[PDB]
């Protein structure tokens with residue numbers, strides 16, 4: 112059968128990301144080869160094979176009318192073999208993929224197996240569209256949501272942060288909050304898909320690795336508090352003395368020099384005690400509902416085989432310890448894609464637009480998952496988290512009002528450093544998640560390790576997208 116030309120993958124502006132390259136496959140009729148044994152050695156040497164092992168193979172297939180000699184020669188190598196003019200040697204034009212951006216977008220684009228079928232990423236997810244039909248009809252062009260310009264920036268900054276932090280791994284996702292598009296998705300470690308010759312390096316961690324989101328979910332606990340009718344931002348919580356006992360469990364703040372904190376101060380000081388006390392007052396049910404509605408631990412609908420769903424704990428009757436730990440993101444499992452999608456809903460005034468890895472021309476209707484008034488109040492609080500005295504100043508994006516939240520998880524001393532946010536605050540365009548796994552220098556807090564990567568990637572992304580600076584007089 113005649114292998115078909117696989118569809119071109121492009122970025123959202125038409126830059127090529129996966130291109131079908133002509134190769135030559137050689138096959139032989141042994142019955143005819145066996146009439147030309149004197150030609151075999153120069154045919155073996157032309158295929159870089161030992162004369163004796165080549166000869167053994169043909170002799171062991173003397174009564175098969177077909178065998179492959181080699182697959183995936185360049186046309187030039189295949190020409191050299193054809194020019195030997197060996198009886199019983201034939202050629203087929205096959206296709207191998209080339210990935211012009213290589214390691215930069217390897218996890219998103221994926222790659223094809225020996226037979227030119229998708230094995231990972233978009234190549235796998237859109238195989239039916241890309242493949243076409245073997246004779247023979249060509250596969251179809253696919254434009255991704257990815258902007259190669261934002262992807263290059265995200266890739267470079269996440270690489271530099273891993274090296275500066277001596278970290279094991281990392282992910283970074285950028286989303287268009289208005290369209291649901293994935294504009295960048297990068298992971299470390301990465302691989303060159305044009306030279307496969309580590310399984311670890313091939314993992315799209317942003318989609319297939321789950322982690323505890325920790326304190327990055329506090330904005331969703333606060334959304335539930337503001338929607339309950341029992342809380343406003345200027346309300347106070349007494350978090351003294353920085354700890355709270357629930358039977359056997361102790362809730363702890365890292366900084367314990369607080370008594371009265373307003374709701375914004377609970378976020379600035381990442382007080383687990385403060386969010387736990389609000390959680391006890393409003394009930395875990397309300398918080399669970401917000402987290403489920405923004406898609407934490409829920410199917411993204413992206414249909415990448417091997418994509419993880421994670422898990423959001425649920426109860427009929429929430430025990431007090433589980434109520435506290437839900438509200439500060441302990442014992443949840445989410446993906447970086449889910450966390451970025453949730454932040455996009457908050458940024459898009461509480462409307463969730465379905466996630467897309469393909470370029471969106473006609474934007475589907477969004478679902479109102481949080482009330483626009485609550486969403487807008489939480490945005491303003493997350494802007495104070497970044498800008499306020501004592502805030503996460505390393506997330507500040509010079510030129511723009513940015514907003515977001517740090518997290519730091521102790522794994523089970525190894526850490527995960529998180530920052531999730533959006534910008535600009537006065538009409539958000541972009542949501543971003545930065546996850547750095549096991550930073551190994553003195554700093555491991557999300558506000559130290561991930562927040563500066565957010566700042567640098569957001570500064571470039573907003574400028575690459577010509578977003579007008581909103582920090583004006």
Ligand SMILES: *C(=O)[C@H](CN1CC(C(=O)NCCN2C(=O)c3cc(O)c(O)cc3C2=O)=C(C(=O)O)N1)NC(=O)/C(=N\OC(C)(C)C(=O)O)c1nc(N)sc1Cl
Nearest residue numbers: 323325326365366381439440441517518519520521556557
């Ligand atoms: C959020 O992820 C929660 C609670 N906290 C941890 C943390 C944090 O407190 N970071 C800020 C640290 N920090 C200060 O307190 C401070 C004070 C001053 O004056 C200055 O100038 C600077 C700083 C400073 O950087 C965060 C955060 O927002 O990054 N949030 N995390 C947890 O409760 C979990 N682990 O907590 C830690 C503290 C990391 C621990 O070792 O136990 C956690 N672990 C999981 N497996 S899931 C969760 Cl949640």
